Amino acid sequence: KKAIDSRIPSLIRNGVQTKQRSIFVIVGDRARNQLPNLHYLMMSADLKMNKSVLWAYKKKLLGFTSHRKKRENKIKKEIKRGTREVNEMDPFESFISNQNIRYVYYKESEKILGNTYGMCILQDFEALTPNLLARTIETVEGGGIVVILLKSMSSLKQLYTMTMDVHARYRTEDVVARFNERFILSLGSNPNCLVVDDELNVLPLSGAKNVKPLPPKPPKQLELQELKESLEDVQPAGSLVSLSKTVNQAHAILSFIDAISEKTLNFTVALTAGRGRGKSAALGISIAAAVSHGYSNIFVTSPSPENLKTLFEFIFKGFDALGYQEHIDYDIIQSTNPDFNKAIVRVDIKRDHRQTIQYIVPQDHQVLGQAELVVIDEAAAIPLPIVKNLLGPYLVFMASTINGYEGTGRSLSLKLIQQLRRQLREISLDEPIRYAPGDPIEKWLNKLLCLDVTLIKNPRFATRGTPHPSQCNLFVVNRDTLFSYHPVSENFLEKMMALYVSSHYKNSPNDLQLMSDAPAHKLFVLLPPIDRIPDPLCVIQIALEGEISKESVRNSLSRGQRAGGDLIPWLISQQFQDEEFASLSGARIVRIATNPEYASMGYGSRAIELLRDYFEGKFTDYSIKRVTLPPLLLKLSEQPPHYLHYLGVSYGLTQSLHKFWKNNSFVPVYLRQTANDLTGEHTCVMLNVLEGRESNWLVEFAKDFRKRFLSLLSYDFHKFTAVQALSVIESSKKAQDLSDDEKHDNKELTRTHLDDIFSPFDLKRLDSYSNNLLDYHVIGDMIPMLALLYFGDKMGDSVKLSSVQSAILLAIGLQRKNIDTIAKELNLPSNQTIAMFAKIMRKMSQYFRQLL
C-alpha cells in the first residue's frame, strides 16, 4: 500500500468542485493500468459525474480488444488451461468490461463531436493533430479528466532532453515534429496539468506543481435560476427558457422570442458564438417557440441536412416542453435519399392549424416567396452570393460559428455584418455550457492552437505614419525558434497567425501542424523598416515543389507512407502531360496574408517582388542543437536560396485576387470546372517564370488554356460575368507578350478554311443582317463561331473591338447568354446593346468581303 502523492487526488477534487477539467500525462509502459484508479477517484469525488469514457487511438489498442465475446473466450481458455483462476480479473479488465467506453479512431473524429464524455483518453502521442485535440477535449464536461499516454521511448527521450535543457531539442535520424515539442512545453504552463509516471509519481516538470486542496464549497447559476423562476408562469416562455443552460443562452432565446413577437418581415437576427456554446439548442428552442406562437411556414437551410440533426433534436425537446405529442400533434418525415442518412427533412404539425417545418438546400431560394421564417445555421459555410439571395422579405435567423469546425475568418463575419448595416439585431453567446467559464484547459488549448488570436490595431503605426512599401524589407522566419514556445516567439507567432486567419476564407486547425513540421515549407514576413516586437505587415508561406522535393519523397516511400503531395506538378501533369515541368523546380505560394485595414497600400505586391528577387539570386547552421536559440528572423542575404524555375499559386478565382496576381506577372494555366462546394468559386493555378530560365513551356501552356477556356465558357463558366471572362483571356495573352520570339504566331483564316466554316448562304445571311434586312434571331446560329474566330485571333489586325463590345460578343457567342442578360450585366439598355451588336457584325462582314 503506497501513499499516492497528495497532488493527484487534490487536482481531481479541485476540478470537480470548480467544474474545471484537468490533464494527466502518464509516462510508462504500464500507463494503462493507472486509468482505472484515476476514474475511480473522479467518480468518488462526485457521483453526478458522467460515467461515459472516450478512448481515442490511431491504429491499435494497447494490448486488449474492445469486442466482448473475443475477451471472454480468451479468458475462458485461460481458465481452462489453468493459467488463471476461475474468477480473477485484474482492475484494468474490470474497468473496460463494466464501464461505458467509446473507442474512436483519430481519423473518424467527426462522429464524437456531438457527444459529451466524462473522461477522455488519447492513446497515441505522436499522431496527435490540432483537429483531433480540439474535437476530443471539447467533449469533456466540467470536472472531467483528459489522459494522454506518452508511452513511447522516443517520446520520453524528448521529454527528458527539454526538461534538462529547454534549448535542446531531441531530434532522431524529414519531419521535425515541432508541434508536439511545443505541445509538451505548453503543458508545463497549464495550472491544471499533472505529468505522472506509471507509478503515479508526479514529475515536477508539470505546471500543477503547487496544487493545494481547496476548502469545501456560482454567480452565473444565480443569474439563471432567478430568471427561470420569474418566467415560470409566462408560457410558452417559461417552459422553453427552462431548457436554457446558461445566462447568455437564455438572453438569446428571449431576444429571439422578441423577434417572433414583433412580426416584422424585414428583420434579421445574427447569432455568433464559439463551438459548444449552445447555438443549435437556442435555434431549436426558438423554432419551437415560433411553432407555439403560430408561425406556420418555418424553413431551415444549411449546407447539408445532416448537420441539422442537433437543431431538430432540440426542437422536439422544445416541443416536449410545450406539451406537443409525436404522432398526435406532429409527424416526422425522414429523408429517402441515402446520402442524407435518413436525416429529418420535414416536421408537419397539426395543432390548432397546419404548421410545417421544412429543410431547404441553400440554392433553392425561389421557394422562399411564401416563407415566414428561415433559420440559416452555419451561414459561414454558405457562399456569400447565395446567402445574399436568401435575405428576402421575411424573418431571418443566422447562426455563424467562430473558429468552429472550419468556420470562417473573423473579418468575413465582420464584412457580412458591414453589408447588413434591413433592420439588424446582433446577439453573441460567450459562456460554455459543459464546464465552468475561464477553464484553464480551454485557455491552454487556444494558446497552443492560436485559435482565439485577434488582430490588434497598432497605435504606433498611426503616430509614425504608414510605412511606404519601398522602405519595408523581407525577412525569413526561422521555424525552430518560432515554435520554441519562448514568450517572445509566442507573441510573434500570434501576430503572424492573426494575419493568416483574417485574410483567407477558410482555415483548418491542422494548418499549424503542416506549417511547423513540413520540410518543404518556408515562411517570409514583410516587417516595417527597423528603427519592441516588430508587427508584420505581410506574411508569405511557400512550399517547394518539383525536383527538389523528390529526395524527401523517396525517403517517405522508403518509410512506407507517402508524405504530402506536389499539387502544381501533379496538376500540370494531367492537364498537359509535359515531362519537363515535372523536372523543373519551383515554389508554390500557399498563402499570402495582409492586414485587411491596410489593404490597397501595396504591401502584398511589394512582398512578392522581394520574394521573386530572392529566388533569382539578386540578394546573394541555424538548426537547433540535436542530441542559445538562433535568431528568430533571418535577413534574406544570410540564407542562400534554392535554385528555382517558376513561382506558382493556387487560389479560388475571384476578380480581386485575379487582378492581384495579374498585376504581378502571373499567367493562368488551369481553371477547375467544378466549383468548390463550400466556397463556390473555381480554383485557378497561375505560374510565373523567373529571369534567366527558359520560358517557352509557359507560353505553350497559356495558349492551350485560352482555347480550353473559350470552349468551356458555355459549359460551367457561363455564371462568370463577361468582364471577368475577358480579364482571364487578357491575362493569358500577357504570357504571349512575355515571349519576344515569333516562333509561335496565330494564323489568319484562309479562304479555304472560311468556306468550310460558313456556307455561302450563311454569308449572304450575314450580309443581309448588316443591311438590316434580317431579324436577329435568324443569325443566332453563326454567333458562337464568330466568337471563336475572333477570340482565336484568326481575324487578325483587321478587326478590333472595344472592351464593352468584346464583352457582348463573348457573352452571346461563348457564355450563350441572352442579349437582354448582357444589358443588366453591362448596365446598358437592351436597345443600345443590339445596336452595338449590329455594328460589331458589320465590321466582321466587311472583313469577310475584303478577304473575298
Partner: protein, 58 residues
Amino acid sequence: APMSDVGGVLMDKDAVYIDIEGEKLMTGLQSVEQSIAEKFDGVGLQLFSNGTELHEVA
C-alpha cells in the same frame, strides 16, 4: 464499497492509498527541481542575427 478497498484503491480521510535506459530517465525526471516555466525565465531570445537578447515581452 467506499470505505473498503475496491480494486486496489483505498481512501482514508483525504489521503488515497493504492497498490502498485528508461528507468534512469524516470529517476532523473523525478529529481528535477526547477519547473519548465521557471527555466524559460532565465532564457533570452535573439530577435535578429545580431540583436540584443530579449527576455520578456512588454
